[PDB]
Write a protein that binds this ligand. Structure first.
Ligand SMILES: COc1cc2cc(OC)c1OCCCn1cc(nn1)CCOC(=O)[C@@H]1CCCCN1C(=O)[C@H]2C1CCCCC1
Length: 128
């Protein structure tokens, strides 16, 4: 399924090229402009432990997830990943624990040394 496809086919978008964040564009967006650091960003997402079935979904809360880009309000993989996305794009991310919740994890939702998968739709973004 989706996680294995990102392992096999995803682009490494880390600076270090450690395969810590892998991305596939699943639907192309429009802009030739990505959000910049500090921007207010609006997304829908579905997220799960890479080995794991049950998703966490913004849809469950009946509203978009909103955060300021590059301010560490989200895991590092999101600050890296969403900075590469255009408005309307849907991307898949597969994330090693170094770019997510590391050795400590974040219980009870995330255990130690967890790989995460996300599908993210970039809905909108506005400058600070
Ligand atoms: C670690 O706590 C959660 C993690 C996630 C979902 C949660 O609730 C729906 C979590 O409870 C906290 C309340 C909501 N929240 C999260 C964040 N800010 N607010 C930022 C920390 O989260 C993140 O940076 C990432 C990316 C942005 C969406 C949420 N997110 C998560 O890591 C999810 C987890 C995805 C993998 C499966 C378990 C939830």
């Amino acid at each position: 399924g989706a996680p294995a496809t990102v392992t096999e086919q995803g682009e490494d978008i880390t600076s270090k090229k450690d395969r810590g964040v892998l991305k596939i564009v699943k639907r192309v967006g429009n802009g030739e402009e990505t959000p910049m650091i500090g921007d207010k960003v609006y997304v829908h997402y579905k997220g799960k432990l890479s080995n794991g079935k049950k998703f966490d979904s913004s849809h469950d809360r009946n509203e978009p997830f909103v955060f300021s880009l590059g301010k560490g309000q989200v895991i590092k993989a999101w600050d890296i990943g969403v900075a590469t996305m255009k408005k309307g794009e849907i991307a898949h991310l597969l994330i090693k624990p170094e770019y997510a919740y590391g050795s400590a994890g974040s219980l009870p939702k995330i255990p130690s040394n967890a790989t995460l998968f996300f599908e993210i739709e970039l809905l909108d973004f506005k400058g600070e």
